[PDB]
């Protein structure tokens, strides 16, 4: 059972911006995804510390890099605290409205795409890379769930019955075609140690 849901106008603005504008700083998407683990990991981390059976679903927290050339996917997973339905179909959208107006204000007063972290909607500089992102999350006492979407101003949301997660958000990126250079150990690698040299958990770039 697929639910299908539209993204609020000023996000499937901001994608339509991220899709269309010329930008060749693209590999800023890693970071940017990274953070978000790093952010996701510590919020278990401190929330563990009253009460520790939240870890009962996994006490490691790390990052995982994991290229697929013949897939044509990047899988970037961590074991942070994942996200609850209502993150994904409606509250999550609710706080990025705020943080887009005023990244889109910002880009027409100078700004540049890469600081599109500074505003909250990071996560959708994957679209710089990806045709299609889905998004496999589960956070405790909740479902486990695939977000996806191509854009177009839609996404989608079902329980996932795939390989169980325990805890944590997969980031699946289906690259575009011209793209596949973030498949690449050593451009994976030059980008990691550019821009998320000081993450705080173990960062693992799988190789095939
Ligand atoms: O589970 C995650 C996570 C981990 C790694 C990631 O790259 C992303 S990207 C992303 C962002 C927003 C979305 C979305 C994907 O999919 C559809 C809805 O909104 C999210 N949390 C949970 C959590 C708690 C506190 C602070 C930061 C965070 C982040």
């Known amino acids: 059972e697929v639910e299908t849901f539209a993204f609020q106008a000023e996000i499937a603005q901001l ?11 693209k590999e800023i998407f890693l970071r940017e995804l990274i953070s978000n683990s790093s952010d996701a990991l510590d919020k278990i ?9 939240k870890l009962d679903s996994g006490k490691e927290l790390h990052i995982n890099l994991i290229p697929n050339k013949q897939d044509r996917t990047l899988t970037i997973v961590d074991t942070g605290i994942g996200m609850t339905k209502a993150d994904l179909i409606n509250n999550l959208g609710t706080i990025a ?5 005023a990244f889109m204000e910002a880009l027409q007063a100078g700004a540049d795409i890469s600081m599109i972290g500074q505003f909250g909607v990071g996560f959708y500089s994957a679209y710089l890379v990806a045709e299609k992102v889905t998004v496999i999350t589960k956070h405790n006492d909740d479902e486990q ?22 805890r944590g958000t997969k980031v699946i990126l289906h690259l575009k075609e011209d793209q596949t250079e973030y498949l690449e150990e050593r451009r994976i ?5 550019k821009h998320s040299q000081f993450i705080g958990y173990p960062i693992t770039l799988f190789v095939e």
């Open 145 to 166: 769930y695939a977000w996806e979407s191509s854009a177009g101003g839609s996404f989608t949301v079902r329980t996932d019955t795939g390989e169980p997660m325990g």
């Open 189 to 193: 690698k030059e980008i990691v140690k």
């Open 45 to 53: 981390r401190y929330e563990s510390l009253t009460d520790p059976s």
């Open 97 to 101: 409205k705020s943080g887009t107006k």
């Open 15 to 25: 994608m339509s911006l991220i899709i269309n504008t010329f930008y060749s700083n």
